[PDB]
Each structure stands twice: as C-alpha cells, then as structure tokens.
mmCIF file of C-alpha atoms and ligand atoms in Angstrom:
data_model
loop_
_atom_site.group_PDB
_atom_site.id
_atom_site.type_symbol
_atom_site.label_atom_id
_atom_site.label_comp_id
_atom_site.label_asym_id
_atom_site.label_seq_id
_atom_site.Cartn_x
_atom_site.Cartn_y
_atom_site.Cartn_z
ATOM 1 C CA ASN A 1 2.494 -41.382 51.976
ATOM 2 C CA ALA A 2 6.086 -41.649 53.211
ATOM 3 C CA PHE A 3 5.882 -41.281 57.003
ATOM 4 C CA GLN A 4 9.544 -40.221 56.943
ATOM 5 C CA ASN A 5 11.150 -39.998 60.389
ATOM 6 C CA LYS A 6 8.024 -40.995 62.319
ATOM 7 C CA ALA A 7 8.291 -43.624 65.042
ATOM 8 C CA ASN A 8 4.891 -43.381 66.745
ATOM 9 C CA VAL A 9 2.368 -43.055 63.914
ATOM 10 C CA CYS A 10 1.376 -46.730 63.687
ATOM 11 C CA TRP A 11 -2.198 -45.494 64.077
ATOM 12 C CA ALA A 12 -1.850 -43.310 60.979
ATOM 13 C CA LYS A 13 -0.517 -46.151 58.843
ATOM 14 C CA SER A 14 -3.540 -48.189 59.940
ATOM 15 C CA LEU A 15 -5.857 -45.544 58.483
ATOM 16 C CA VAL A 16 -4.273 -45.675 55.026
ATOM 17 C CA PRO A 17 -6.358 -48.684 53.903
ATOM 18 C CA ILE A 18 -9.498 -47.081 55.335
ATOM 19 C CA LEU A 19 -8.755 -43.816 53.538
ATOM 20 C CA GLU A 20 -8.260 -45.758 50.304
ATOM 21 C CA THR A 21 -11.873 -46.939 50.399
ATOM 22 C CA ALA A 22 -12.820 -43.254 50.382
ATOM 23 C CA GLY A 23 -10.274 -42.467 47.683
ATOM 24 C CA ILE A 24 -8.336 -40.238 50.071
ATOM 25 C CA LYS A 25 -4.545 -40.097 49.746
ATOM 26 C CA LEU A 26 -2.800 -37.941 52.351
ATOM 27 C CA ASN A 27 0.883 -37.041 52.146
ATOM 28 C CA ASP A 28 3.182 -36.168 55.052
ATOM 29 C CA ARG A 29 2.424 -32.426 54.901
ATOM 30 C CA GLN A 30 -1.336 -32.993 54.971
ATOM 31 C CA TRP A 31 -1.118 -35.474 57.840
ATOM 32 C CA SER A 32 0.893 -32.935 59.832
ATOM 33 C CA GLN A 33 -1.373 -29.948 59.224
ATOM 34 C CA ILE A 34 -4.568 -31.830 60.075
ATOM 35 C CA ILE A 35 -3.479 -33.769 63.162
ATOM 36 C CA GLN A 36 -1.061 -32.137 65.617
ATOM 37 C CA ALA A 37 -0.249 -35.565 67.038
ATOM 38 C CA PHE A 38 1.143 -36.655 63.675
ATOM 39 C CA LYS A 39 3.234 -33.499 63.353
ATOM 40 C CA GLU A 40 4.680 -34.041 66.828
ATOM 41 C CA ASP A 41 4.972 -37.784 66.181
ATOM 42 C CA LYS A 42 2.868 -38.945 69.125
ATOM 43 C CA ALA A 43 0.768 -41.963 70.064
ATOM 44 C CA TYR A 44 -2.869 -41.723 68.994
ATOM 45 C CA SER A 45 -6.034 -43.588 68.021
ATOM 46 C CA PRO A 46 -7.050 -44.383 64.404
ATOM 47 C CA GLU A 47 -10.765 -43.722 64.986
ATOM 48 C CA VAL A 48 -9.995 -40.386 66.629
ATOM 49 C CA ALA A 49 -7.688 -39.369 63.786
ATOM 50 C CA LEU A 50 -10.233 -40.551 61.215
ATOM 51 C CA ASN A 51 -12.698 -38.108 62.758
ATOM 52 C CA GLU A 52 -10.399 -35.145 62.155
ATOM 53 C CA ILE A 53 -9.629 -36.284 58.607
ATOM 54 C CA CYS A 54 -13.306 -36.794 57.790
ATOM 55 C CA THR A 55 -14.037 -33.327 59.167
ATOM 56 C CA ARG A 56 -11.323 -31.592 57.142
ATOM 57 C CA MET A 57 -11.798 -33.505 53.890
ATOM 58 C CA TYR A 58 -15.593 -33.659 53.918
ATOM 59 C CA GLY A 59 -16.730 -30.905 56.286
ATOM 60 C CA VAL A 60 -18.594 -33.441 58.414
ATOM 61 C CA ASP A 61 -17.531 -35.760 61.242
ATOM 62 C CA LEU A 62 -17.885 -39.525 61.716
ATOM 63 C CA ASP A 63 -21.474 -39.137 62.940
ATOM 64 C CA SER A 64 -22.491 -38.611 59.306
ATOM 65 C CA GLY A 65 -21.841 -42.319 58.801
ATOM 66 C CA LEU A 66 -19.361 -41.701 55.986
ATOM 67 C CA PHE A 67 -16.978 -44.342 57.371
ATOM 68 C CA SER A 68 -19.434 -46.627 59.158
ATOM 69 C CA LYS A 69 -19.154 -49.385 56.547
ATOM 70 C CA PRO A 70 -17.121 -52.366 57.883
ATOM 71 C CA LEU A 71 -14.408 -52.722 55.226
ATOM 72 C CA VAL A 72 -11.124 -52.427 57.130
ATOM 73 C CA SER A 73 -10.289 -53.446 60.693
ATOM 74 C CA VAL A 74 -8.093 -51.548 63.141
ATOM 75 C CA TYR A 75 -6.572 -53.765 65.819
ATOM 76 C CA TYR A 76 -5.104 -52.551 69.104
ATOM 77 C CA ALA A 77 -2.704 -54.526 71.292
ATOM 78 C CA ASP A 78 0.441 -53.833 73.319
ATOM 79 C CA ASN A 79 0.458 -50.101 72.542
ATOM 80 C CA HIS A 80 0.326 -50.695 68.783
ATOM 81 C CA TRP A 81 -2.215 -50.401 65.970
ATOM 82 C CA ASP A 82 -2.383 -52.525 62.828
ATOM 83 C CA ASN A 83 -4.932 -54.116 60.493
ATOM 84 C CA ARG A 84 -5.609 -57.582 61.915
ATOM 85 C CA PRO A 85 -9.210 -58.807 61.736
ATOM 86 C CA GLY A 86 -11.148 -58.701 65.009
ATOM 87 C CA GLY A 87 -11.039 -54.961 65.618
ATOM 88 C CA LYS A 88 -13.322 -51.998 64.989
ATOM 89 C CA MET A 89 -14.060 -51.790 61.267
ATOM 90 C CA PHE A 90 -14.394 -48.663 59.135
ATOM 91 C CA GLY A 91 -14.757 -47.908 55.431
ATOM 92 C CA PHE A 92 -16.382 -45.473 53.024
ATOM 93 C CA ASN A 93 -20.177 -45.680 53.120
ATOM 94 C CA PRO A 94 -21.891 -44.910 49.777
ATOM 95 C CA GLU A 95 -25.280 -45.226 51.489
ATOM 96 C CA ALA A 96 -24.281 -42.489 53.934
ATOM 97 C CA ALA A 97 -22.915 -40.337 51.108
ATOM 98 C CA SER A 98 -26.235 -40.511 49.255
ATOM 99 C CA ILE A 99 -28.077 -39.141 52.288
ATOM 100 C CA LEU A 100 -25.640 -36.225 52.522
ATOM 101 C CA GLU A 101 -26.323 -35.404 48.872
ATOM 102 C CA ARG A 102 -29.861 -34.364 49.797
ATOM 103 C CA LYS A 103 -28.711 -31.355 51.807
ATOM 104 C CA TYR A 104 -25.551 -30.866 49.757
ATOM 105 C CA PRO A 105 -26.278 -31.668 46.074
ATOM 106 C CA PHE A 106 -22.958 -30.203 44.920
ATOM 107 C CA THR A 107 -21.093 -33.117 46.519
ATOM 108 C CA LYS A 108 -22.672 -35.754 44.267
ATOM 109 C CA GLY A 109 -20.005 -37.976 42.727
ATOM 110 C CA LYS A 110 -17.147 -35.979 44.232
ATOM 111 C CA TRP A 111 -16.516 -38.119 47.313
ATOM 112 C CA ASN A 112 -13.743 -40.378 46.034
ATOM 113 C CA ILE A 113 -11.377 -38.186 44.005
ATOM 114 C CA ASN A 114 -8.966 -37.294 46.818
ATOM 115 C CA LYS A 115 -10.321 -33.738 46.861
ATOM 116 C CA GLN A 116 -11.406 -31.554 49.780
ATOM 117 C CA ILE A 117 -15.128 -30.779 49.786
ATOM 118 C CA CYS A 118 -16.242 -27.434 51.201
ATOM 119 C CA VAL A 119 -19.952 -26.648 51.089
ATOM 120 C CA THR A 120 -19.402 -23.331 52.866
ATOM 121 C CA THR A 121 -17.673 -21.771 49.886
ATOM 122 C CA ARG A 122 -18.820 -24.412 47.394
ATOM 123 C CA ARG A 123 -15.347 -25.428 46.220
ATOM 124 C CA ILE A 124 -13.658 -28.711 45.344
ATOM 125 C CA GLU A 125 -9.881 -28.327 45.482
ATOM 126 C CA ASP A 126 -6.775 -29.947 46.957
ATOM 127 C CA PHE A 127 -6.459 -29.914 50.754
ATOM 128 C CA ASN A 128 -6.503 -26.391 52.200
ATOM 129 C CA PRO A 129 -5.261 -25.972 55.815
ATOM 130 C CA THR A 130 -7.943 -23.366 56.613
ATOM 131 C CA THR A 131 -10.914 -25.235 55.125
ATOM 132 C CA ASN A 132 -13.628 -27.231 56.924
ATOM 133 C CA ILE A 133 -12.529 -26.498 60.493
ATOM 134 C CA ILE A 134 -15.934 -27.130 62.084
ATOM 135 C CA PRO A 135 -18.286 -29.991 61.085
ATOM 136 C CA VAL A 136 -21.547 -28.765 59.544
ATOM 137 C CA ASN A 137 -23.551 -31.869 60.460
ATOM 138 C CA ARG A 138 -22.815 -31.663 64.179
ATOM 139 C CA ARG A 139 -24.890 -29.498 66.507
ATOM 140 C CA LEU A 140 -22.485 -28.116 69.107
ATOM 141 C CA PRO A 141 -23.381 -29.185 72.686
ATOM 142 C CA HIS A 142 -22.406 -25.719 73.930
ATOM 143 C CA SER A 143 -21.352 -22.284 72.699
ATOM 144 C CA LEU A 144 -17.751 -21.667 71.666
ATOM 145 C CA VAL A 145 -15.888 -18.362 71.787
ATOM 146 C CA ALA A 146 -15.453 -16.561 68.461
ATOM 147 C CA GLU A 147 -11.919 -15.349 69.162
ATOM 148 C CA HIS A 148 -9.306 -16.814 71.502
ATOM 149 C CA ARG A 149 -8.097 -14.487 74.241
ATOM 150 C CA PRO A 150 -5.496 -14.857 77.031
ATOM 151 C CA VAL A 151 -6.820 -14.238 80.553
ATOM 152 C CA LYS A 152 -4.879 -13.435 83.720
ATOM 153 C CA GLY A 153 -6.550 -14.782 86.835
ATOM 154 C CA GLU A 154 -5.989 -16.337 90.232
ATOM 155 C CA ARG A 155 -3.879 -19.387 91.088
ATOM 156 C CA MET A 156 -5.107 -22.987 90.993
ATOM 157 C CA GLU A 157 -4.896 -23.428 94.762
ATOM 158 C CA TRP A 158 -8.155 -21.548 95.307
ATOM 159 C CA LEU A 159 -10.063 -24.080 93.214
ATOM 160 C CA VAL A 160 -8.234 -27.135 94.528
ATOM 161 C CA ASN A 161 -8.388 -26.245 98.231
ATOM 162 C CA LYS A 162 -12.184 -26.101 97.959
ATOM 163 C CA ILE A 163 -12.382 -29.651 96.599
ATOM 164 C CA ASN A 164 -12.765 -32.397 99.200
ATOM 165 C CA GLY A 165 -10.042 -35.043 99.319
ATOM 166 C CA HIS A 166 -6.759 -35.092 101.222
ATOM 167 C CA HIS A 167 -4.581 -37.448 99.168
ATOM 168 C CA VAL A 168 -4.021 -35.792 95.794
ATOM 169 C CA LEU A 169 -2.479 -36.982 92.535
ATOM 170 C CA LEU A 170 -1.253 -34.055 90.447
ATOM 171 C CA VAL A 171 -0.658 -34.716 86.758
ATOM 172 C CA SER A 172 0.981 -31.510 85.539
ATOM 173 C CA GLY A 173 4.014 -30.060 83.783
ATOM 174 C CA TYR A 174 4.504 -27.828 86.806
ATOM 175 C CA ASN A 175 3.947 -28.051 90.566
ATOM 176 C CA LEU A 176 1.216 -26.442 92.675
ATOM 177 C CA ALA A 177 1.344 -25.230 96.278
ATOM 178 C CA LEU A 178 -1.404 -27.261 97.953
ATOM 179 C CA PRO A 179 -0.709 -27.020 101.725
ATOM 180 C CA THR A 180 -3.969 -28.586 102.931
ATOM 181 C CA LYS A 181 -3.321 -31.566 100.663
ATOM 182 C CA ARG A 182 -0.871 -34.457 100.532
ATOM 183 C CA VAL A 183 0.321 -34.138 96.950
ATOM 184 C CA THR A 184 1.940 -36.686 94.641
ATOM 185 C CA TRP A 185 3.197 -34.857 91.552
ATOM 186 C CA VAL A 186 3.588 -36.733 88.271
ATOM 187 C CA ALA A 187 5.249 -34.905 85.390
ATOM 188 C CA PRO A 188 6.281 -35.660 81.791
ATOM 189 C CA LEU A 189 9.699 -37.224 81.155
ATOM 190 C CA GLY A 190 12.531 -34.747 81.674
ATOM 191 C CA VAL A 191 10.872 -32.623 84.352
ATOM 192 C CA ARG A 192 12.804 -32.152 87.600
ATOM 193 C CA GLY A 193 11.375 -31.926 91.111
ATOM 194 C CA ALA A 194 8.363 -34.180 90.583
ATOM 195 C CA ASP A 195 7.664 -37.346 92.562
ATOM 196 C CA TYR A 196 7.271 -39.402 89.392
ATOM 197 C CA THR A 197 7.952 -38.836 85.697
ATOM 198 C CA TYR A 198 6.175 -40.768 82.952
ATOM 199 C CA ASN A 199 5.561 -40.546 79.217
ATOM 200 C CA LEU A 200 2.070 -39.055 79.417
ATOM 201 C CA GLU A 201 1.551 -39.991 75.770
ATOM 202 C CA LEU A 202 1.075 -43.521 77.113
ATOM 203 C CA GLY A 203 -1.447 -42.456 79.743
ATOM 204 C CA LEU A 204 -1.028 -43.137 83.456
ATOM 205 C CA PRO A 205 0.144 -46.397 85.055
ATOM 206 C CA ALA A 206 -2.222 -47.986 87.545
ATOM 207 C CA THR A 207 0.852 -48.617 89.724
ATOM 208 C CA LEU A 208 0.443 -45.009 90.866
ATOM 209 C CA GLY A 209 -2.235 -46.151 93.302
ATOM 210 C CA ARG A 210 -5.614 -44.689 94.215
ATOM 211 C CA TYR A 211 -6.213 -41.188 95.572
ATOM 212 C CA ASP A 212 -8.965 -39.011 97.026
ATOM 213 C CA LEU A 213 -8.504 -36.404 94.303
ATOM 214 C CA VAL A 214 -6.896 -36.696 90.875
ATOM 215 C CA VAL A 215 -6.001 -33.391 89.225
ATOM 216 C CA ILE A 216 -5.247 -33.572 85.508
ATOM 217 C CA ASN A 217 -3.512 -30.313 84.661
ATOM 218 C CA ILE A 218 -2.120 -30.601 81.133
ATOM 219 C CA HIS A 219 -2.482 -27.648 78.762
ATOM 220 C CA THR A 220 -3.186 -27.875 75.043
ATOM 221 C CA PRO A 221 -1.912 -24.985 72.882
ATOM 222 C CA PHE A 222 -4.584 -22.996 71.016
ATOM 223 C CA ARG A 223 -4.854 -23.503 67.259
ATOM 224 C CA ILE A 224 -7.096 -21.911 64.610
ATOM 225 C CA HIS A 225 -10.397 -21.942 66.517
ATOM 226 C CA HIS A 226 -11.913 -22.805 69.906
ATOM 227 C CA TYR A 227 -13.364 -25.976 68.382
ATOM 228 C CA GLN A 228 -9.911 -27.008 67.179
ATOM 229 C CA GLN A 229 -8.508 -26.685 70.694
ATOM 230 C CA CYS A 230 -11.129 -29.140 71.943
ATOM 231 C CA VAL A 231 -10.103 -31.419 69.085
ATOM 232 C CA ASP A 232 -6.384 -31.135 69.869
ATOM 233 C CA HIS A 233 -7.193 -31.828 73.535
ATOM 234 C CA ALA A 234 -9.542 -34.791 73.072
ATOM 235 C CA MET A 235 -6.863 -37.500 73.068
ATOM 236 C CA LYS A 236 -5.599 -36.189 76.411
ATOM 237 C CA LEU A 237 -9.120 -36.469 77.825
ATOM 238 C CA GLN A 238 -9.296 -40.050 76.575
ATOM 239 C CA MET A 239 -5.828 -41.045 77.758
ATOM 240 C CA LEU A 240 -5.347 -39.207 81.052
ATOM 241 C CA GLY A 241 -9.040 -39.013 81.907
ATOM 242 C CA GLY A 242 -9.716 -42.701 81.349
ATOM 243 C CA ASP A 243 -6.602 -43.945 83.129
ATOM 244 C CA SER A 244 -7.444 -41.828 86.182
ATOM 245 C CA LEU A 245 -10.370 -44.134 86.985
ATOM 246 C CA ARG A 246 -7.943 -46.844 88.117
ATOM 247 C CA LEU A 247 -6.371 -44.224 90.375
ATOM 248 C CA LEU A 248 -9.479 -43.174 92.300
ATOM 249 C CA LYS A 249 -10.513 -44.328 95.767
ATOM 250 C CA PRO A 250 -14.198 -44.863 96.568
ATOM 251 C CA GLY A 251 -15.786 -41.421 96.897
ATOM 252 C CA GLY A 252 -12.850 -39.835 95.092
ATOM 253 C CA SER A 253 -13.004 -36.857 92.740
ATOM 254 C CA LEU A 254 -11.510 -36.071 89.334
ATOM 255 C CA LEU A 255 -10.530 -32.555 88.271
ATOM 256 C CA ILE A 256 -9.522 -32.062 84.643
ATOM 257 C CA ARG A 257 -8.340 -28.907 82.905
ATOM 258 C CA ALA A 258 -10.019 -28.726 79.503
ATOM 259 C CA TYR A 259 -11.782 -26.493 76.982
ATOM 260 C CA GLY A 260 -15.205 -28.128 76.831
ATOM 261 C CA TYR A 261 -16.386 -30.965 74.600
ATOM 262 C CA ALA A 262 -17.158 -29.294 71.279
ATOM 263 C CA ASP A 263 -16.082 -32.343 69.260
ATOM 264 C CA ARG A 264 -17.575 -35.842 69.093
ATOM 265 C CA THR A 265 -14.563 -37.568 70.657
ATOM 266 C CA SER A 266 -14.502 -35.296 73.714
ATOM 267 C CA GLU A 267 -18.237 -35.598 74.412
ATOM 268 C CA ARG A 268 -17.900 -39.381 74.285
ATOM 269 C CA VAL A 269 -15.200 -39.359 76.956
ATOM 270 C CA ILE A 270 -17.223 -37.107 79.249
ATOM 271 C CA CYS A 271 -20.335 -39.285 78.971
ATOM 272 C CA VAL A 272 -18.278 -42.354 79.856
ATOM 273 C CA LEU A 273 -16.610 -40.597 82.799
ATOM 274 C CA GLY A 274 -19.877 -39.142 84.079
ATOM 275 C CA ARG A 275 -21.543 -42.506 84.682
ATOM 276 C CA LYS A 276 -18.901 -43.270 87.322
ATOM 277 C CA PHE A 277 -19.597 -40.379 89.691
ATOM 278 C CA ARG A 278 -22.480 -39.111 91.810
ATOM 279 C CA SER A 279 -22.265 -35.722 90.088
ATOM 280 C CA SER A 280 -20.479 -33.966 87.225
ATOM 281 C CA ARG A 281 -19.880 -30.249 86.691
ATOM 282 C CA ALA A 282 -18.386 -27.901 84.119
ATOM 283 C CA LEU A 283 -16.538 -25.080 85.860
ATOM 284 C CA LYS A 284 -15.153 -21.737 84.729
ATOM 285 C CA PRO A 285 -13.341 -20.639 87.921
ATOM 286 C CA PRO A 286 -11.391 -17.355 88.292
ATOM 287 C CA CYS A 287 -8.220 -19.448 87.974
ATOM 288 C CA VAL A 288 -8.591 -19.966 84.217
ATOM 289 C CA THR A 289 -5.721 -18.862 81.976
ATOM 290 C CA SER A 290 -7.705 -18.197 78.809
ATOM 291 C CA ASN A 291 -10.981 -17.377 77.080
ATOM 292 C CA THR A 292 -11.544 -21.003 76.080
ATOM 293 C CA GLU A 293 -10.462 -22.752 79.266
ATOM 294 C CA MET A 294 -12.582 -24.661 81.781
ATOM 295 C CA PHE A 295 -12.546 -27.543 84.277
ATOM 296 C CA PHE A 296 -14.428 -30.822 84.597
ATOM 297 C CA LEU A 297 -15.164 -31.846 88.178
ATOM 298 C CA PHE A 298 -16.399 -35.395 88.708
ATOM 299 C CA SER A 299 -17.384 -35.997 92.341
ATOM 300 C CA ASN A 300 -17.871 -39.129 94.454
ATOM 301 C CA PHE A 301 -16.450 -42.021 92.439
ATOM 302 C CA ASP A 302 -18.307 -45.328 92.796
ATOM 303 C CA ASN A 303 -17.145 -47.012 89.585
ATOM 304 C CA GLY A 304 -20.803 -47.415 88.652
ATOM 305 C CA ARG A 305 -22.812 -47.221 85.430
ATOM 306 C CA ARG A 306 -25.527 -44.642 86.086
ATOM 307 C CA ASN A 307 -27.523 -42.536 83.647
ATOM 308 C CA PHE A 308 -25.663 -39.530 82.285
ATOM 309 C CA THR A 309 -26.605 -36.854 79.771
ATOM 310 C CA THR A 310 -24.656 -33.672 79.066
ATOM 311 C CA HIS A 311 -27.790 -31.514 79.213
ATOM 312 C CA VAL A 312 -26.829 -29.873 82.510
ATOM 313 C CA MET A 313 -23.216 -29.326 81.458
ATOM 314 C CA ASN A 314 -24.531 -27.869 78.202
ATOM 315 C CA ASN A 315 -26.247 -25.089 80.161
ATOM 316 C CA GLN A 316 -23.238 -24.536 82.417
ATOM 317 C CA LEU A 317 -20.839 -24.110 79.493
ATOM 318 C CA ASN A 318 -23.221 -21.844 77.576
ATOM 319 C CA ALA A 319 -22.983 -19.420 80.488
ATOM 320 C CA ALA A 320 -19.203 -19.841 80.601
ATOM 321 C CA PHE A 321 -18.696 -19.336 76.855
HETATM 322 NA NA1 LIG B 401 -9.770 -35.376 68.164
#
C-alpha cells in the first residue's frame, strides 16, 4: 500500500493494478513476508513476483492461468518497470478460476475478496505467512528434501579443477583458490580483493568479456522450505545465469550454484539456458554446503537453439534429493 522507504520496488508498484483485477490488496508487511526481494528492497521482475503472490494467496502458481487475462501491461525499459502499453499483459482470469472450482469447490466466489485461499486446511482468512508455501497445481520436476540440513564437505576447487576451461570468470562473494585456472573474480559492491565489483542486483555487464568457464557462486539463504529456497533463488538464476551467456566463448561452460528448479520460474531459466549448450547436467558434488544445494553445469556453448527437456535432469536430481 505505502511502499515506505523503498527505492527499488518499481516492479511491485507495477503489480498493484494487476492485483486489483483479482481483488488483492497487499500492504507493506505482506509484500515483505511473501517476497524477500521486497523486504530487502531489491530489483526484481513483476511476472516473477506475481508468481509468488499467486502461490501464497491462491495456493497455485501462474500455470493455473489465474492471471493470464490481458488486462494490465507491465513495461520494462532502462532498468525500470511501469504500466505503459506494449508489454506483457496480466489480469485476473474468471475462466481459469471456474476450471479450478472443479477440483476445489470451496473456492467458488471467494477469489476476489482480498482473502488467502488454502485448500489444504480449507480456510479463508487474511494472509498467513505459513500458508500456501507450495503450489498444489504444479507437479514438481524433482524431489525436494523434507527438512533443511547443513552439510560440511570438500572445497570448491575439486569440482572446478575438473571442469575444462582455462580462463575463468568467478562471480562470488568470496574468492577461490584455482591454481590451474586464470581467474577473474567479480564480487558485490563493497567487497575487497576482487578484480571487479558490481551491483549483482543488476546482473552482469557484458563489458566483462567472454571466458572459457563462468562460475556463478552466489548463495541464497534458506527459508521455510526447500521449495522456497528455489523460489528465493530464481531471480538470481534469471539475472546472473542469463547475463553469463554474453560472457561465454565458443565451447565455453557455465557452472551455477543452485538448489534445483522446483518452481516455475527456475525451470524456465534452465530450459532457456540448456538450448545453448551441447550438454546440461545437475550435479550434487561432495563440495556442497547443504542438504538442498546443487550445481548446474552447462557444457560447450554454441549460442544455439537446440531441443531441451529437463527429463534427464529430473532423474539426476531425484537421486540427489
Ligand atoms: Na521466484
């Protein structure tokens, strides 16, 4: 409602009109609890945020079609979101709501009263921070862990030294000892000792050049459930993962620390990234730091548009989790 003391939530203000079509009115507290990026006042994407809000408020994600009706546009330009025409359009979809009412009769006529709808424990009350964590409509691409658990393992070097590619770009909050490599370390603003510091909430600048191996090594704190960690990490996949493509030499590889792709946003990013490499793997090396952690390894970059399904990564991550 207020957006008091928030300088980077232009994306959130762009969702207000879209939420209105659904009858949803979020205040500052509710914005913060749902989306970590809002709480920390960080750059973000309206569609991505709308997915989290749809999941929490309705118990289902955007793939239910609840907001697929073109009523309000979200326009992106010059690192800024607003509501000019000519952008992706969203809006509450009564047709989609009707379909949902088949499986969940108790929801009928309760969509647009600014109330949270939980079919699990059939309740209709004001927003509850612990309600509707995981979307009921979405079939998870791979197993998640039931309880988060810290894990002490080996260093990163033993995974990185095995990956082909001499010239390495390291995007991390801390440095790694990679002797066999020629490393260029990029860190967030404020970090000392790195070759370059940038605001990683704006992605990576293509002026960094192209490398044989790009290692994205940014952690995302655990919150609530394994699925939620994937959610909280998705934007990073989009931002740092996508921008890395302009920083890859022909035949280059991309290593990304992640936690899978349990959510819709994450799986999208992976599919997009996969089409650009000769192979794609989901790794759970001994150098993981937690129960939910893993690594994406995209090999041999040719900037192409090949066929890519997550069926093979789905089996790899089922064994990991
Ligand atoms: Na997300």
